[PDB]
Amino acid sequence: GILENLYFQGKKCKYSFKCVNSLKEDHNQPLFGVQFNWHLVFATVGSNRVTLYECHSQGEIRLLQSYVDADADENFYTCAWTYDSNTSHPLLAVAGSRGIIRIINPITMQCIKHYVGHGNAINELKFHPRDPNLLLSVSKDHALRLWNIQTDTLVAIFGGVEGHRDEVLSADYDLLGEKIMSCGMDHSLKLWRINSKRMMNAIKESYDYFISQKIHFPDFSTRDIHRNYVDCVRWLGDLILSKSCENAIVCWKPGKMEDDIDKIKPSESNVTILGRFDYSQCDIWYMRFSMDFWQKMLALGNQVGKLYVWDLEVEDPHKAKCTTLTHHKCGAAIRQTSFSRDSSILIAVCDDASIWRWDRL
Ligand SMILES: COc1cc(-c2cc3n(c(=N)c2C#N)CCc2cc4c(cc2-3)OCO4)ccc1OC(C)C
Ligand SMILES: [Pr+3]
């Protein structure tokens, strides 16, 4: 007790960041997304633009190239990075209000292919952590869709009888990509196992190319975590982090305290809430939080330009865990943050088209 506190305090050199740079995008429209390539370079999405930037020494943010959609009415809400499974060259998927996924070559910032589900707004994209070809999209039409971008096939549609009853806003794969947790405007969080016999066969068939699987039932469902819509969800090992508009990110897990995630049945009625990360003034819809590659840091921006950064490695609920980052010129809603794979740079993007670079010192 005393010994472990003396050890924690003695070494303590708390997460500290300093704003080194800031930019404003000429379009003046909100930036909804930002992602560093984890496969130095980051992409931003907003309006009908996808902009590629590179971080340099002396806190410089360098504009590289931009993809401008021919449809000026397109509003991209999300982007995700992958790589070509053969050439190892990077790829970027983007999507938004039109409901079209564009696969962009970031070297030349050109769309090389595109996919359409039912043409409904796409709220988030995520690539499978083990298969660079498997792309998950979540939609305003209440479904999640799994695409094979190597064979251009829609592997599966997650939705139906027991699928989401309203817009799906976010989803995340676990570390091995055996399961997906999704959340949305119907206030629920649903687990979908993609290592089931049915999904393993659908993925194999997709690689032999199409008849898509329609997965009507999740492997777990809950509306017991939040009393309002859930706009962001991420896996934290075998635990889940999710948030609503109640100024808290909730850490939880399906079942009772001792229940193993792989033994949870669809009929499971219990949820264990381990704790919350509290903050203020972030009660507007569609504000994402993010973690670094190694999942040791959690960050969320609020509707007034304040950034919150929590240390996930402090297990003691009493100890200092939260660092707040402000800049007098950053007064707009921070919609998403992204950490560099090295976890030394944190970028925040805003409603007034501004980009904020924070360097970890
Ligand atoms: C068509 O224009 C607008 C659209 C939105 C808007 C934003 C988002 N989603 C929407 N459904 C929507 C809508 N409708 C869903 C996906 C999402 C994810 C986000 C996010 C925002 C969004 O931030 C963090 O991750 C807001 C302002 C607009 O317009 C002004 C620029 C005039
Ligand atoms: Pr610890």
Residue numbers in the entry: 66 to 104, 111 to 280, 289 to 440
Task: Provide the authors' own sentences about this structure as they appear in the paper.
Polycomb repressive complex 2 (PRC2) is an essential component of the epigenetic machinery, regulating gene repression primarily through methylation of histone H3K27, which leads to changes in chromatin structure and thus exerts influence on key biological processes such as embryonic development. The minimal core PRC2 complex is composed of three protein components: the catalytic subunit EZH2 (Enhancer of zeste homolog 2), the WD40 domain comprising EED (embryonic ectoderm development), and the VEFS domain comprising SUZ12 (suppressor of zeste 12). EED contains seven WD40 repeats and adopts a canonic β-propeller architecture with the ‘top’ portion for H3K27me3 binding and its ‘bottom’ portion anchored to the N-terminal helix of EZH2. The recognition of H3K27me3 by EED and the resulting increase of the methylase activity are believed to be crucial for the cellular function of PRC2 in propagating the repressive marks at the chromatin loci.
